[PDB]
RNA sequence: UCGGCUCGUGCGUCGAUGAAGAACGCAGCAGCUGCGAGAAUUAAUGUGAAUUGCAGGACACAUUGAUUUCGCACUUGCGGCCCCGGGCCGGGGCUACG
């Protein structure tokens, strides 16, 4: 099933290295999280088939500060947007190094040395893999 | 042929309040040209959305609104007088002949 897709996706825009798969599924758990509430059929203890973001008839008085132990869709979105804003701010940090052609007098370019200077996959995976390797070892043992 | 030459017309305005001329410097990226450390121009007015070889003006929509060097001497040499500030240094104003 996936062997055929392995070689074809690389050609073109450049959505290869399997990272295009990771972003699609990772963002999916974030974006379809909102759409889960209207489509959720399980209730547990409170009605959910009609959604929980707007439930004024069910609650109301109305306790807007509900228990966010399941479907925290109301509160986690508040905190996550803060993380999105802070990361992009630190993403733009870089030290610009003056650079010029060794033959032509004129335009000056800058070699950018990013603050991270390493793609997130090489750094975070090396810490993600060891965390996964630790867990599987303890589960087996 | 965005240059000359010739004729004609009107005007006919330089300078110690420092001229003509010279030097040096000024553009984000030599010359010519334009400018003077406010240096490829500031203000104002009119005009009105461009400048342009290249990305880079929030252009308040009341589109205010784009388009220096050339007192004594000429080596930056040496002063003097009066103030100001910092503790000798820096700044300002003076100091040619008739």
Q: How far is the CA of A16 from the C1' of B88 (A)?
A: 74
The SS3 call for residue A125 is: helix
Resolution value, angstrom units = 2.7
Token output for A137:
């070892």
**Contact (Cβ atoms closer than 8 angstroms) between residue A68 and residue A74:** yes
CA-CA distance, A101 to A83, in Å (whole number)? 40
**Quick one: A48 exposed, middle or buried, by C-beta within 10 A (0-12, 13-18, 19+)?**
buried
Rounded CA–C1' distance between A113 and B67, in angstroms: 40
Residue A100, SS3 per DSSP: coil
How far apart (Å, rounded) are the C-alpha atoms in residues A108 and A110?
7
Q: Which nucleotide is nearest to A106 (CA to C1')?
A: B29
Q: Solved how?
A: cryo-EM
Strands A109-114 and A94-99, sheet pairing: antiparallel
Residues 73-112 of A with CB under 7 A from strand B: 105-107
With a 7 Å cutoff on the CB, does A122 touch strand B? no
Angle, alpha carbons A64-A65-A71 (nearest 5°): 95
Q: Are A110 and A99 in contact (CB under 8 A)?
A: yes
Nucleotide nearest to A105 (CA to C1'): B29
**CA dihedral sign of residues A15, A17, A18, A22:** negative
CA distances from A44 to A8, A51, A58 (A): 45, 13, 15
């Amino acid at each position: 099933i996936v062997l055929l897709l392995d070689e074809l996706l690389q050609k073109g825009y450049g959505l290869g290295s399997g990272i295009s798969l990771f972003i699609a599924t990772n963002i999916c758990e974030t974006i379809v999280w909102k759409a889960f509430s209207p489509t959720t059929v399980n209730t547990g203890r409170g009605m959910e088939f009609e959604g929980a973001i707007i439930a004024l008839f069910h609650l109301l008085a109305l306790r807007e500060a509900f228990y966010r132990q399941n479907l925290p869709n109301l509160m986690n979105l508040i905190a996550t947007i803060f993380v999105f804003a802070v990361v992009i701010y630190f993403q733009g940090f870089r030290v610009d190094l003056p650079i010029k052609s060794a033959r032509y007098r004129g335009q000056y370019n800058t070699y950018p040395i990013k603050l991270f200077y390493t793609s997130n996959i090489p750094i975070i995976l090396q810490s993600a893999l060891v965390s996964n390797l630790y867990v599987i070892s303890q589960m087996l043992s």
